Amino acid sequence: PTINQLVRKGREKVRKKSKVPALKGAPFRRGVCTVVRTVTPKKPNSALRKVAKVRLTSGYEVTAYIPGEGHNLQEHSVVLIRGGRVKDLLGVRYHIVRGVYDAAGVKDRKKSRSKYGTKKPKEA
Amino acid sequence: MLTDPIADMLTRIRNATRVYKESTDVPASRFKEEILRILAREGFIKGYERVDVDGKPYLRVYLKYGPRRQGPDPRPEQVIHHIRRISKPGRRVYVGVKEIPRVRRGLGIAILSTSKGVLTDREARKLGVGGELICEVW
RNA sequence: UUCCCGGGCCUUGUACACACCGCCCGUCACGCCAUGGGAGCGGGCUCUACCCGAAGUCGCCGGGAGCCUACGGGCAGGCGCCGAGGGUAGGGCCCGUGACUGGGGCGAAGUCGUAACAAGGUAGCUGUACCGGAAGGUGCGGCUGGAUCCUUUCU
RNA sequence: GGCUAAUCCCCCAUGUGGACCCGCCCCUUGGGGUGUGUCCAAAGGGCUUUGCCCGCUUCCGGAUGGGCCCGCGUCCCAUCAGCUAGUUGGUGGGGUAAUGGCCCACCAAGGCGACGACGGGUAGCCGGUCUGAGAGGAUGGCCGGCCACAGGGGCACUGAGACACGGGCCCCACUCCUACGGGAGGCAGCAGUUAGGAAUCUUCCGCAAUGGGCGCAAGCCUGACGGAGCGACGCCGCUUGGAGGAAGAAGCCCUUCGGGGUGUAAACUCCUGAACCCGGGACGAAACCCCCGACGAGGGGACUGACGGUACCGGGGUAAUAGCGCCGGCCAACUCCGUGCCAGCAGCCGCGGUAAUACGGAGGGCGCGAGCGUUACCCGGAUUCACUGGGCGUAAAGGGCGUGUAGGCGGCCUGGGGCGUCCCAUGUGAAAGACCACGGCUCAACCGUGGGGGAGCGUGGGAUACGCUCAGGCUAGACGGUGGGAGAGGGUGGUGGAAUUCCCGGAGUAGCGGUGAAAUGCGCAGAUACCGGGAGGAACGCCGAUGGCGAAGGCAGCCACCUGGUCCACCCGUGACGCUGAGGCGCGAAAGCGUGGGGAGCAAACCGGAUUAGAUACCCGGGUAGUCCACGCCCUAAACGAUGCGCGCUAGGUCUCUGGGUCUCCUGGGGGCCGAAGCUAACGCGUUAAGCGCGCCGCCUGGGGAGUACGGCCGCAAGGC
Ligand SMILES: [Mg+2]
Ligand SMILES: [Mg+2]
Ligand SMILES: [Mg+2]
Ligand SMILES: [Mg+2]
Ligand SMILES: [Mg+2]
Ligand SMILES: [Mg+2]
Ligand SMILES: [Mg+2]
Ligand SMILES: [Mg+2]
Ligand SMILES: [Mg+2]
Ligand SMILES: [Mg+2]
Ligand SMILES: [Mg+2]
Ligand SMILES: [Mg+2]
Ligand SMILES: [Mg+2]
Ligand SMILES: [Mg+2]
Ligand SMILES: [Mg+2]
Ligand SMILES: [Mg+2]
Ligand SMILES: [Mg+2]
Ligand SMILES: [Mg+2]
Ligand SMILES: [Mg+2]
Ligand SMILES: [Mg+2]
Ligand SMILES: [Mg+2]
Ligand SMILES: [Mg+2]
Ligand SMILES: [Mg+2]
Ligand SMILES: [Mg+2]
Ligand SMILES: [Mg+2]
Ligand SMILES: [Mg+2]
Ligand SMILES: [Mg+2]
Ligand SMILES: [Mg+2]
Ligand SMILES: [Mg+2]
Ligand SMILES: [Mg+2]
Ligand SMILES: [Mg+2]
Ligand SMILES: [Mg+2]
Ligand SMILES: [Mg+2]
Ligand SMILES: [Mg+2]
Ligand SMILES: [Mg+2]
Ligand SMILES: [Mg+2]
Ligand SMILES: [Mg+2]
Ligand SMILES: [Mg+2]
Ligand SMILES: [Mg+2]
Ligand SMILES: [Mg+2]
Ligand SMILES: [Mg+2]
Ligand SMILES: [Mg+2]
Ligand SMILES: [Mg+2]
Ligand SMILES: [Mg+2]
Ligand SMILES: [Mg+2]
Ligand SMILES: [Mg+2]
Ligand SMILES: [Mg+2]
Ligand SMILES: [Mg+2]
Ligand SMILES: [Mg+2]
Ligand SMILES: [Mg+2]
Ligand SMILES: [Mg+2]
Ligand SMILES: [Mg+2]
Ligand SMILES: [Mg+2]
Ligand SMILES: [Mg+2]
Ligand SMILES: [Mg+2]
Ligand SMILES: [Mg+2]
Ligand SMILES: [Mg+2]
Ligand SMILES: [Mg+2]
Ligand SMILES: [Mg+2]
Ligand SMILES: [Mg+2]
Ligand SMILES: [Mg+2]
């Protein structure tokens, strides 16, 4: 565009939409489970995934993925939402954090325990 | 009406040299004549002279080239590899004396118009004046 | 040498490339959140006309209608304008709820077709217009982003 | 209701002086001088009381602090386009320290807005900070500057100063006291509780230091502050040992069963000596005070710690925490086993359905290391909003076309000005930060001292090339004059022939039509075919082109009139009068709408005949709106060259339309095809640019959702923007 046109009008800065309304700007949010279900993955894969509907402290209600192997989560257990999505599941934007509140860290897991919230095994 | 006669001179020259013409006529004005004087002094052209064409005054710019070449494409190197406008009507540009550009690490020129007259970049720094930044040439 | 099957060479078109036993379109039924519409309803703000109006400054009265006086005046007191907010009547904004429905977008994959891509089997596209189970058909005009000088589906 | 003191209040006096009205002088907004007139001061206290000290009063000036005013700069939405009644100005007045619609009365009818008024949304602003090669983007925690608020809203009093966080009056909400009448409250001060939240500390020590308030002082206050406490929250420094030690123990890992790995790693040898114990032990701190001197200067000269017995020095002294992510590509690090579309991984690409270097452990490896990963957010990359630094023939993108308003842009020569522009000088750009240097804690982080830097703005001076401006020239742009031309350019009227249909007439039989075949249909009321006559509507064969004209849509018989654009020649006239053009306004195929006409042929809808698995379609027979005209709407399109307008520049060749010419050819202006240079992702483009440039307008920013929704505007509707 001509310069005169840039004075008259000028470039437009580009707004971006937040992939996570955990609202609040918050890095995590505490919520209570509602449904603890299994879910069918999107077309390219096959499995049984463990997700949970959650009512947040933000007055928001969303499904959240349960990572790790085993999970003790039940209907009324209270949990901490992480954020980050699961590419192959429709409509799940956030993750559960294991080891926090009622979410139990993955039992027996020896490899990367920072994620999955398990503590260090003792060896003698 | 030429909307920017200076740009038109620069271009006339560009197109000319690109088809390897020996000379070109550009419609004349003292300001163009000043620019040319700088090119000539600076080694870019063989120099220029005033002519009349159907009674109307022009300037023959005589063009300078490298020697003939080896292999495919014997066409000689250009002496003006690059010539471009900086200040144009509709966006005008002025450098202070500390904003004067070092053009192609100095193997090039920038022609400024100043209140001391039309000078090269070195010329202006040495003179110590800023001005309207016209051409960039290398 | 027209035709049936298999095949070779040049060329052309293509949205095919697990390569025409290819692609892909839509309907309806069916598995999903989101959207509007959403009558009204619950309430928040603000606007306008009118009415009520605390405090307090300011103006007036301050009277054999109070108090002080050196008689100049002072205070108490009364009245008035302004005025926080309140009420009445409608105008807009906004949030929550929500009868009610539009299609949407994939979604277990079924269904009936064959519209488009090869002259896709009636060249396609197109603004419009009527029509139709559905891709759609047809009228008028346009475009080339069209091939080469009876019908006959699908994988 | 009563008593009473004062540095509390009031009345005369003195007028240094000052205030005020009127005059005069200077100055120039209400600054200063002056004369008369009127009006205005004070407070006392302590000492060693014959002198000093603390105070008080009127004034002038200084200093510091603030009030008010102006230029400029300071986010998003135009689906917010009009806003405005004290609103805009005036006269007079009120109020204040002071200008002012700040307020009031009266007068005029103004003021603001696309240069974005009004509306809505978000938000304290800055020094700076993060990021970035930079330009830029993002942010404003702590520290410093300014503003604003102190439960919500209004208000004033006191005062140098407030419309006052720990002051007051009132209204509302909330909590508490209540003899039900009425009262009391206000941590966004330091700690602490409670709630909300992913989450954010001690109800500590001290006034020793610095600072602030009062006081002659001694001194008192000080949750400002100086410290300590808790939290790897951040930064910096430090430890978990050092040297020797097998051609290499065991265990675990792989194995080609030869052996390879963990690995000098461990053991062990020797050495230092974190923690810890013992002893000494701070600076931070010399003023205020005391003495000499005159309560000065000067000289001396003693008291004074929270931190803390802490930092540090000296002595002694033990081998004494390692974790976390990752190892398919991006990306540094690979192998067994286990699991078989499971269980699971996942930032994207994508792994897993029996050999998985991608899942899960193990061995080994890489990376960092008192940390390491994750999530959220910002800049980065991203030249993906392109100022630097992008695009629009087919990828997203040229507005359907024009006219022209604002605006942007502007040929050649001379001169005045000096607004932009440039230069110099000076002021300002606080400190902190940033950069440089030196230095202080053993180093650093941290701190001090110094230096340099700096956009911007103020003032003075200077330059005049360019931009601007004013004046004066010019003719190369533009327009004009004269003459000549081509044309389906537009509008109005008229007229011609062909064909269809229909009606009349003649003549003449048994069919015609139609299809791949057929049938519907028409025909004995005589059709088709053939001849003659009439009526009527619509469109113009050959000419006709790969042609012409028009801004586009678009425009074909012929004639006349009305009329627009355009090209060439002459070189005559004006003298830059130019280009582009947001908004506006007008035009705008077809279909569609309204009112009225008209109606041959064609023909959506529809009615039938076929075909087919069905046929709602293609094919056949009919047929209405419509197609035609007048007037008024509609405003779309593959409105296509999918290519905005203008100007200058850059090989040629060939065909052609149309002017001029010395008419083998040359020269203008159009239409095409090849092709220099060059451009292009390619295909292509290539003096009819998609090349090289300049000006201006329009538009684009992954696909679907969707040209949908909502809002507005237009429209009779359809529906359009
Ligand atoms: Mg000159
Ligand atoms: Mg010369
Ligand atoms: Mg530039
Ligand atoms: Mg064959
Ligand atoms: Mg052969
Ligand atoms: Mg072959
Ligand atoms: Mg094709
Ligand atoms: Mg091919
Ligand atoms: Mg295939
Ligand atoms: Mg289907
Ligand atoms: Mg149903
Ligand atoms: Mg009252
Ligand atoms: Mg009054
Ligand atoms: Mg009285
Ligand atoms: Mg009163
Ligand atoms: Mg009132
Ligand atoms: Mg009210
Ligand atoms: Mg719904
Ligand atoms: Mg088809
Ligand atoms: Mg079709
Ligand atoms: Mg077809
Ligand atoms: Mg057909
Ligand atoms: Mg039909
Ligand atoms: Mg059609
Ligand atoms: Mg057609
Ligand atoms: Mg086509
Ligand atoms: Mg069939
Ligand atoms: Mg099928
Ligand atoms: Mg009394
Ligand atoms: Mg009493
Ligand atoms: Mg007495
Ligand atoms: Mg007194
Ligand atoms: Mg007196
Ligand atoms: Mg006097
Ligand atoms: Mg005077
Ligand atoms: Mg006097
Ligand atoms: Mg007295
Ligand atoms: Mg003073
Ligand atoms: Mg001031
Ligand atoms: Mg902001
Ligand atoms: Mg809207
Ligand atoms: Mg008013
Ligand atoms: Mg008034
Ligand atoms: Mg008056
Ligand atoms: Mg006044
Ligand atoms: Mg006051
Ligand atoms: Mg303006
Ligand atoms: Mg902000
Ligand atoms: Mg705010
Ligand atoms: Mg920086
Ligand atoms: Mg930096
Ligand atoms: Mg910066
Ligand atoms: Mg900034
Ligand atoms: Mg900011
Ligand atoms: Mg702040
Ligand atoms: Mg601050
Ligand atoms: Mg200030
Ligand atoms: Mg307030
Ligand atoms: Mg509070
Ligand atoms: Mg409140
Ligand atoms: Mg308040």
Ligand SMILES: [Mg+2]
């Ligand atoms: Mg006071």
Ligand SMILES: [Mg+2]
């Ligand atoms: Mg108050």
Ligand SMILES: [Mg+2]
């Ligand atoms: Mg206040």
Ligand SMILES: [Mg+2]
């Ligand atoms: Mg308080």
Ligand SMILES: [Mg+2]
């Ligand atoms: Mg009270």
Ligand SMILES: [Mg+2]
């Ligand atoms: Mg808590």
Ligand SMILES: [Mg+2]
């Ligand atoms: Mg809590």
Ligand SMILES: [Mg+2]
């Ligand atoms: Mg602290």
Ligand SMILES: [Mg+2]
């Ligand atoms: Mg204490």
Ligand SMILES: [Mg+2]
């Ligand atoms: Mg102190």
Ligand SMILES: [Mg+2]
């Ligand atoms: Mg002190």
Ligand SMILES: [Mg+2]
């Ligand atoms: Mg004092």
Ligand SMILES: [Mg+2]
């Ligand atoms: Mg004393």
Ligand SMILES: [Mg+2]
């Ligand atoms: Mg106290």
Ligand SMILES: [Mg+2]
């Ligand atoms: Mg402190």
Ligand SMILES: [Mg+2]
């Ligand atoms: Mg911790």
